[model samples]
Target: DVQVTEDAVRRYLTRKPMTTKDLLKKFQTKKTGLSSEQTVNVLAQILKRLNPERKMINDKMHFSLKE
Candidate 1:
């Protein structure tokens, strides 16, 4: 299983609202060890598993949230 860190996801999302394809590309460019497809898939899974009640407010500058 790929170990996808919050830091990695945060960094990746900062650039823009990336599709799974875009995410894969970024992951590859960053040499994150995980393939783009893998990164996207893992991230998607995590997002799906996350609680919807907990809002995900992406602060563009910070790439993180506080809400």
Candidate 2:
């Protein structure tokens, strides 16, 4: 599951920046079984780990990878 989360974040952010809502929408499309809340939980976990590296940023709204 860790790898899955990692890959999803990598792919999603690689394309462009997005807000939590936008990322949740995109993730829900790719993974139909998950609810929005669940999607957010997953993203939160991934962001938690990635946040320390400063590879990703979330300003309580938008999210984007460092360039």
Candidate 3:
């Protein structure tokens, strides 16, 4: 079981911005087996630290580094 943490998502965000649902589903499909409670909690903090921007898509809040 791999725990994909903020550091992991941080690097990936260098390319495409992703939403909450889409982002979670990404690792869920690519490299599965993450603790539910733990994952949610950690992922929450992950996005919290993201000083990212967003684009309009039904008010879709996508995340990426603020660079």
Candidate 4:
């Protein structure tokens, strides 16, 4: 039961750009035991904070750390 913290999200996104679905899948499979809805909630909170510095690609669906 890993806690889905902002740093965890940032670390995951550091690997590559990801859509919300991709992010959820990664957490579900690799990182945590969170359900899809829990992952989305975590993403929403982290994205809100990272929005200023994050980059949105592919019709604003994929996100990545700004280069």
Candidate 5:
């Protein structure tokens, strides 16, 4: 519960790229206390400095840390 959001996500990404939705699923799977509405926009900003890059997959944005 003390882990910082941005760094927490950075620590999880070790494979392929991921979408915000996908990452949120994993985050909450390892976390709790609230649902999507409370966390969605927060995570979006976290990605901003991952050196995050985006692509259109399934017509949706998939981003990852400079990978």
Candidate 6:
């Protein structure tokens, strides 16, 4: 199983607003330990599915707080 770190999730959430590319860069540079674009994409999709109710609010590029 792929383990998603709290730091990764935290860093993602803290962005409040971001694009997939932005989140990818953030995850790559941040201490999330994720090292690939695929990972970032996977995470974004996972977060999307997990938070379907807030889908429209997300930027679709990643995990932004505004649709």
**What is each predicted model's overall lDDT from 0 to 1?**
0.50, 0.61, 0.69, 0.69, 0.67, 0.54
Candidate 2 overall Cα lDDT vs. reference? Answer: 0.61
Between candidates 1 and 5, the lDDT winner:
5
Higher-scoring candidate on lDDT, 1 or 3: 3
Worst 10 residues of 1 by lDDT: 51-60
* Residue 26, candidate 4: C-alpha displacement in angstroms: 0.9
What lDDT tens digits, residue by residue, belong to model 3 across residues 1-67? Answer: 6667667787767777777777666667665466666667777787787655666555777776655
Model 4, residue pairs in steric clash: none
Provide the clashing-pair count of each candidate structure: 1, 0, 0, 0, 0, 1
CA error at residue 46 for candidate 3, angstroms: 1.7
Looking at candidate 4, the ten consecutive residues that score lowest on lDDT are 50-59
Candidates in order, TM-scores: namely: 0.40, 0.58, 0.66, 0.63, 0.59, 0.42
Residues 3-64, candidate 5: write the lDDT tens digits.
44666776656456687778878767655565666667767777775656677778888766
lDDT string, candidate 1, 1-67, tens digits: 4476655655545544444444445556555676666777787776455311222235422222233
RMSD of each: 6.4, 4.9, 2.5, 3.0, 2.9, 5.7
Q: Over 4 Å off in model 2, which ranges? A: 1-4, 52-61
Best-to-worst order by lDDT is 4, 3, 5, 2, 6, 1
Off by over 4 Å in 4: 31-35, 52-60
Model 6 pairs whose backbones collide? 20-61
The candidate that achieves the highest TM-score relative to the unseen native structure: 3
Between candidates 1 and 2, the TM-score winner: 2
Residue-wise C-alpha lDDT for candidate 4, range 23-42, written one tens digit per residue:
67767777576677777877
